[PDB]
Ligand binder design. Structure first.
Ligand code: FMN
Length: 108
């Protein structure tokens, strides 16, 4: 199946994205200059369910994995359904260093 992949830096307080696969840029319409250094939430918009957003916010704050389905918007404004799985990456001392995300466009 077609998916995309990003890495977020958890050592920075607001989990900016530091790496994205070619598919992530191609799927969203945004280039590296608009994606790198930014929190993934710029993909959100009017129809995004705040309850699902809250699930990821809590899991990130708690350093747990999380899988949620979100309405997202491309650079051109058009919406798509993003099945998103975030995974915490810990150092051996228990601290979370990075979050990794798999994003699937599940508009089908
Ligand atoms: C986004 N993918 C994504 C990938 C990773 C690795 C992480 C850590 C987060 C995301 N987000 C969410 C965003 O960064 C944030 O966690 C949430 O919006 C909730 O926190 P706030 O503070 O905003 O309430 C992704 N969000 C998207 O909308 N699309 C993704 O692809």
């Amino acid at each position: 199946l077609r998916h995309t992949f990003v890495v977020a830096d958890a050592t920075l307080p607001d989990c900016p994205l530091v790496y994205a696969s070619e598919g992530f840029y191609a799927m969203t319409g945004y280039g590296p200059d608009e994606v790198l250094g930014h929190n993934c939430r710029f993909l959100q918009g009017e129809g995004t369910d705040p309850k699902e957003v809250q699930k990821i916010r809590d899991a990130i704050k708690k350093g747990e994995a999380c899988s949620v389905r979100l309405l997202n918007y491309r650079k051109d404004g058009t919406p798509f359904w993003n099945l998103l799985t975030v995974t915490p990456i810990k150092t051996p001392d228990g601290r979370v260093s990075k979050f990794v995300g798999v994003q699937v466009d599940v508009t089908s």
